[PDB]
């Protein structure tokens, strides 16, 4: 506001409380990473192919 | 209303004094005059008030908050 011929601004304090669960989920993923795995079939040579 | 106000304002010129009935009539006329011109202002929002998600605001515009802040008067004339 003008506030007696000035432009003092409103105080805007920030207390971030929504990042804790996001950090927990990210840590949960990074503790147990997953990747691609190839499964064999019912053949005489599928195991070596998968390996 | 105007006549009663003027009459009350110019009695001492002739060295006289009002009477209770004239005073009541003047008060009633003044109240009637003030009733017609009465306006009741309303309080607008601050300008740092969040607008709910139900208004479907956009990050494209500054509609995320109520307007009326008058910011960014920067330029020359330093020491500010």
Task: Write a structural description.
This is part of a larger assembly, with chains A (51 residues) and B (80 residues). With 51 residues, chain A is an all-alpha fold. Helix content of chain A is 33%, strand content 0%. Chain A has helices at residues 20-31, 46-50. The N and C termini of chain A lie far apart (71 Å). In chain A, 0% of the residues are buried. In chain B, helix 1 crosses helix 2. Chain B contains two helices and no strands. Chain B is elongated. Chain B has helices at residues 2-9, 20-36. Chains A and B meet through loops of A and loops of B. Chain A: It comes from Shigella phage Sf6. Chain A: This is Gene 3 protein. Chain B: It comes from Shigella phage Sf6 (Shigella flexneri bacteriophage VI). Chain B: One of its GO terms (biological process) is symbiont genome ejection through host cell envelope, short tail mechanism.
Percentage beta strand of chain A = under 5%
Structural class of chain B: mainly alpha
Distance between the termini of chain A: 71 Å
Largest interface, C-beta closer than 8 angstroms, per-chain residues = A-B, 6 and 6 residues
Write down how many β-strands of chain B occur, each being a DSSP E stretch of 2 or more residues: 0
Helix content of chain A: 25-40%
Described by strand count, sense and barrel closure, the largest sheet of chain A is: none
Structural class of chain A: mainly alpha
Q: Any idea what the shape of chain B is?
A: elongated
Assembly state:
part of a larger assembly
Features:
part of a larger assembly, 2 chains, A: mainly alpha, rod-shaped, B: mainly alpha, structural protein, bacteriophage, Sf6 portal, gp7, coat protein
């Amino acid at each position: 506001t003008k506030l007696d011929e000035q432009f003092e601004k409103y105080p805007k304090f920030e207390i971030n409380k929504v990042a804790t669960e996001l950090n927990r989920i990210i840590a949960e993923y990074r503790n147990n990473r997953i990747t691609v795995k190839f499964r064999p079939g019912d053949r005489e040579a599928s195991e070596e192919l998968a390996n | 209303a105007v006549g009663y106000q003027l009459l009350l304002r110019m009695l001492s010129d002739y060295s006289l004094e009002p009477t209770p009935q004239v005073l009541s009539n003047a008060q009633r006329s003044y109240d009637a005059l003030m009733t017609d011109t009465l306006v009741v202002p309303s309080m607008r929002r601050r300008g740092d008030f969040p607008v709910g998600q139900g208004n479907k605001y956009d990050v494209f515009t500054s509609d995320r908050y109520y307007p009326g802040d008058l910011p960014l008067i920067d330029g020359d004339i330093p020491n500010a």
